[PDB]
Amino acid sequence: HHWGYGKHNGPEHWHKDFPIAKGERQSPVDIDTHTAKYDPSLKPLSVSYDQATSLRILNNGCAFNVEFDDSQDKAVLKGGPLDGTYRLIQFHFHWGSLDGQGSEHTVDKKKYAAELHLVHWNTKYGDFGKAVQQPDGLAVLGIFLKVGSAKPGLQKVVDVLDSIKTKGKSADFTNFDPRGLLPESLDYWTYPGSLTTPPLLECVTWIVLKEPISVSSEQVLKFRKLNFNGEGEPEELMVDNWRPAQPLKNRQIKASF
Template sequence: MQHLILLASLFSLCTSSSDWCYPSQYSCDNQCNLPEFWNHANAACGGRAQSPVNVVTRKTVPDGRLTPFHFHNYQQTFRSSMKNNGHSVQVSLSHLATIQGGDLMTGYKAVQFHLHWGKSGGPGSEHTIDGEQYPMELHIVHMKQQYTDLSTALADPNGIAVLGFFYEESRSANKKYEHIINALQKITETSSNTSLSPISLEQLIPSRQNLTSYYRYKGSLTTPGCTESVIWTLFENTIPLSKGQLQAFSNLRFHNGMPMVGNYRPPQPLNGRLVYRSGAAALLAGAALLVASVSVTLGLSQSR
């Protein structure tokens, strides 16, 4: 808390910029708007349907319409480039991969994916589940199939669909991520890019049978301009990466040369919005409550 107060004090003393930034970038030499002041950089960031959010599982609403997704061409390998865009790692996609189902009213085509992470494998996801922040979060951004550019899709209140995936630290390296990890060392500086060896979206995410448990809510982009036109889907099953793989992302640098760490926006108020859960997610939430109840009961009996 004292750290945040100090940053806010510095902001009031020395900022005169309209640029936005993360706290890890901020200094009087790099004057910029911290997340709590992003509405100064873009008014939409002060809206009432902003992302990310903290998902409180006991308050989520079961929704039978949240059926399994249909993934088309997710298994198809593609060639692309990976870029340090100054605030994340981004890979552009060629619109071959699409999603349907999951109560989406139409098909959406993949446009790009990027990530958000902490410092050296520490907490860094944007969304949180019951207050838990994961080491990293993957966003696969899709737009409605009828659109040809993101700006047009963003003008549609439901024009964008983002699939969010959480990472967890594992004991062994995830070989499916070798191409991504190896490419990071070639894009340490802002605006640098490198060719990416052929990969598929399917190899980057959990297997399809593990993609039936998810949460859904209506929100926004998590960076300025914070446009509120995103249908968010957050999957429960995590992606494993070793500590070394997670730490590799912290070797990148922001445009001012500072380490690219902590590039996540804090959770935003729901402001009355509901978060829905798929049937499989409801079963898992119920099982978790049952385990907690049994644990409490056992604890009480043992204390007598």
């Protein structure tokens, strides 16, 4: 794909091919914690990952995706602002070149080192590609990463990155438990938005956890050794693969706490 994160094809350029980039419900956004309102109508969030079946990890030239078997309700998200059942299809991260940037969402304008997106699709639409055409097709669980203590549950991801350095490379990645990437609290903010990469479809209910997870400098450093390019091409470190905050326009962010 043409688009990217370079100064010639980055986020400021996307609108030329994807005019929805200047749409009414684009993501990410800044979460103003003093404007977000507690919503007692929200039901408890249910993260049901015990039967998760990971398959593979893929460098797709933009991030790396850990892919799951979504042929059955094996790892689902329910509750919270959601109606129905949303199946985990993949997770990926966005991260920076420096520890002071990398997240897509911001919290009172604070940028985190990275942001994990666990992507789920609404089973009432039958498959992911149909779901992304619907305003309630996806539910993305967003989790901030800050640099501190190592995250043990991330280390298996870190250790395979050497095997998917360049675009198009994949590796088997079975028996990975995504529960190890969750913080202790499931307190979140929620709002209607979009994919944060082209095609930027406005199909996401965003659920952004308040509590970050901590990862070590060594761990995030390993993310930064990935490459955007394909093998045998000049090296372009995979860093700063984040879209900045977009206008909130006619939306309200709700808090679960």
